[PDB]
Amino acid sequence: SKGKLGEKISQFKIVEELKAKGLYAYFRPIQSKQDTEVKIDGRRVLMFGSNSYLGLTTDTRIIKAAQDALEKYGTGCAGSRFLNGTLDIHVELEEKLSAYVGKEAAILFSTGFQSNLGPLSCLMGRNDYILLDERDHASIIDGSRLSFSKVIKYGHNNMEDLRAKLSRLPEDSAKLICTDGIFSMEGDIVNLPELTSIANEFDAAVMVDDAHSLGVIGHKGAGTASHFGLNDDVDLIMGTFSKSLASLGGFVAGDADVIDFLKHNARSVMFSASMTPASVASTLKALEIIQNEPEHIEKLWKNTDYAKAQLLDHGFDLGATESPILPIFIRSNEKTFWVTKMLQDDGVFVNPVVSPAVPAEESLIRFSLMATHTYDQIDEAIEKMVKVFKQAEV
Amino acid sequence: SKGKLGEKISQFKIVEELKAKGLYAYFRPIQSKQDTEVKIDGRRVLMFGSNSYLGLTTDTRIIKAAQDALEKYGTGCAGSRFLNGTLDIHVELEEKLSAYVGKEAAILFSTGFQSNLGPLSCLMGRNDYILLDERDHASIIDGSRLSFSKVIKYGHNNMEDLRAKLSRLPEDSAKLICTDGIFSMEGDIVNLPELTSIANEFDAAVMVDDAHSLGVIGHKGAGTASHFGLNDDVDLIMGTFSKSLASLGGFVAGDADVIDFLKHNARSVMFSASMTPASVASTLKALEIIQNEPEHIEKLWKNTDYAKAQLLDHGFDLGATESPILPIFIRSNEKTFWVTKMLQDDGVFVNPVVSPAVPAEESLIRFSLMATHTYDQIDEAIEKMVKVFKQAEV
Numbered sequence A, B: 001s002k003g004k005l006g007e008k009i010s011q012f013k014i015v016e017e018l019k020a021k022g023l024y025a026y027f028r029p030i031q032s033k034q035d036t037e038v039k040i041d042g043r044r045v046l047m048f049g050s051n052s053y054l055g056l057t058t059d060t061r062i063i064k065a066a067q068d069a070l071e072k073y074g075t076g077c078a079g080s081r082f083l084n085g086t087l088d089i090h091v092e093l094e095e096k097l098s099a100y101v102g103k104e105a106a107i108l109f110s111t112g113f114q115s116n117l118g119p120l121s122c123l124m125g126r127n128d129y130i131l132l133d134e135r136d137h138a139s140i141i142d143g144s145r146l147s148f149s150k151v152i153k154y155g156h157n158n159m160e161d162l163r164a165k166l167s168r169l170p171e172d173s174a175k176l177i178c179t180d181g182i183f184s185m186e187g188d189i190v191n192l193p194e195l196t197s198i199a200n201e202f203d204a205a206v207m208v209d210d211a212h213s214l215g216v217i218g219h220k221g222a223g224t225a226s227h228f229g230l231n232d233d234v235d236l237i238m239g240t241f242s243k244s245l246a247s248l249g250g251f252v253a254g255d256a257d258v259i260d261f262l263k264h265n266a267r268s269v270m271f272s273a274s275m276t277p278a279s280v281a282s283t284l285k286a287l288e289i290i291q292n293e294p295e296h297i298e299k300l301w302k303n304t305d306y307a308k309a310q311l312l313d314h315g316f317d318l319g320a321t322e323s324p325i326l327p328i329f330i331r332s333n334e335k336t337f338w339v340t341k342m343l344q345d346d347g348v349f350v351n352p353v354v355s356p357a358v359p360a361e362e363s364l365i366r367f368s369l370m371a372t373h374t375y376d377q378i379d380e381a382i383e384k385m386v387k388v389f390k391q392a393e394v
């Protein structure tokens, strides 16, 4: 019955207002492969809103690996990994990820999101604590809320705040710090050296979420711990397959006893169907390519360095990024929506960040690079972005 | 750092004990398609532990649809639906599901699990209530814990307990009842007529989780509301693609305003990458097949009716199932583990249910039918199950 439910949703007007004003640009229906250009409503649009940092969703080798796994294994495993849903190829990918990130063991999840839910819900319990960077990804916050622990946020990359908060806690309790590696909104990197120094002082476990780091930073893309040389000071390395690795799913890697505990105790792996064979095989093949072919990462960073320089040169105001995510400040929600739609209508796809996710005054568009972008494409997008910012009067 | 973390996991011994005793049968690595027989360690094993109720993960049409979507769209969409991760085929599948279950609108999630997290986390808030059947799926409990509401469990299919609990609540609050349609442990069906009668009395929203109902009950498999004729008294119909529909993902369908609210407010859709093209296309093609070819559902039920009769005839003690899930009581955890492994070693795959998920005295194995099972296969499995139950002295 719907009386009260109708009242709950009644105040949510922003989408109808966007649509009525002709500004709506969420759920844009793409008609083609995710690529440097996509087709929307039959037209070509430059894609600067993706997470496919290495451009690999179109790699024919990866497509063929996925198609071959469909031929061999079918369309789905129809059960949790725990029961009837494990394949030899899941175990192969676990072994290969473990080797890549330098850990004993790994457990796959059917999404990145569920990869965070798993360890955050089941390791810290009553009388324990989880310490979260305040800008951590929503899946981290949610995973932590599924624990029976006390969840404490600390100031973004604020090591004094982290230390202070840890200091106040009872000695006779377990603690686990979870942080994004690269934070996607502003594209900045966690201060992992200090964070791990503090963790070691207070015997706190460390978990890093490398969604946006894998295939981006670290040796041959192996992530944030790798980037800093701090493999031995990070207990759990979490990643996703939906970004550089061009697929769907994620994993948590760590010590075999911890991973064994997780795979038998995390609700998000015991009570959710396993990754499809196609996604296992595309992740396996992408992981090979990222390591074997250094040009992908190199070109991603050439593009990043070029675009960033070109944006700064044109007088855009960028956030403190250290990654291929280039946040461009606009500082007005209305303007952010207008710019986003005007760019769409002129063939450029960027992602808006607006209230209530951030304050109006920090609203921005996020311009992300892929290895497969050309300098010409970047130049066209920036040309158009200059014109639109003027039309919008930013 | 790992001192306290090591202590947290130190008491979890059951897996090492199972392994050391040669009883361990979780995460069994399958080497073939999910089918009525699977290959494990090079040997053939009858599969009676699956959720693929219609046997469709091996359907060449569905495989080819998935392979063709890989060719056209690549291996992944590399973003949330909200941003750059929507395809025309996602929208097509939403429209087709909406039509199938008789609702205005639907929103896809990349897993069934996340499909429950979405609406349960974001519709009821502070000062509201979610009422859950105590045997609801873990994803429902978790989704509800992600809300800012008060979560109340009621006794399993206990309409008096539901009514009483609703009665005590403030009038000036929203309420939402969420139930599994078919409950998978015992295979029983919710008392949706009474539940909806109560909901209507207290103006509570109703959400049904049809993971195990779609492709099983209802007209042409359209689920629990369909089975009872109660489409108009159920606000939200949730389903998964990982069972009958032979894929990965799920959906929530309902009124367009509610669905519009969800797709912009549920963290599990805004902050998680979209379904892979292959899984969209396999779900689309399976949904066509389920409707167009009535033989699948018919044969599933012929098998169910045959197996159930054959088990009862051999003196097995079954749970109160109304579905293709046949729970077979053993009532000893040790025996449940032994039986499970002995059957595995003799070429029969069943799923154990043990403490702490249930009391020792209600421990059981779950024997699930698929449309593609033959009577000969059922007979072989039951023959073997008689021998093992004797060897184990149940």
Ligand SMILES: Cc1ncc(COP(=O)(O)O)c(CN[C@@H](CO)C(=O)O)c1O
Binding pocket: A078, A079, A080, A083, A270, A271, A272, A273, B051, B111, B112, B113, B114, B116, B137, B139, B180, B184, B209, B211, B212, B240, B241, B242, B248, B249, B250
């Ligand atoms: C009633 C119900 N609701 C939701 C889900 C979650 O769906 P998913 O497995 O597609 O994520 C399941 C999963 N059920 C299986 C895994 O697919 C399990 O082993 O629990 C379910 O049974």
Ligand SMILES: Cc1ncc(COP(=O)(O)O)c(CN[C@@H](CO)C(=O)O)c1O
Binding pocket: A051, A111, A112, A113, A114, A116, A137, A139, A180, A184, A209, A211, A212, A240, A241, A242, A248, A249, A250, B078, B079, B080, B083, B270, B271, B272, B273
């Ligand atoms: C740091 C971090 N950790 C975890 C996840 C979840 O991974 P998933 O999208 O593969 O489920 C994301 C998702 N990030 C994207 C969707 O892929 C988003 O729009 O939020 C992430 O950025």
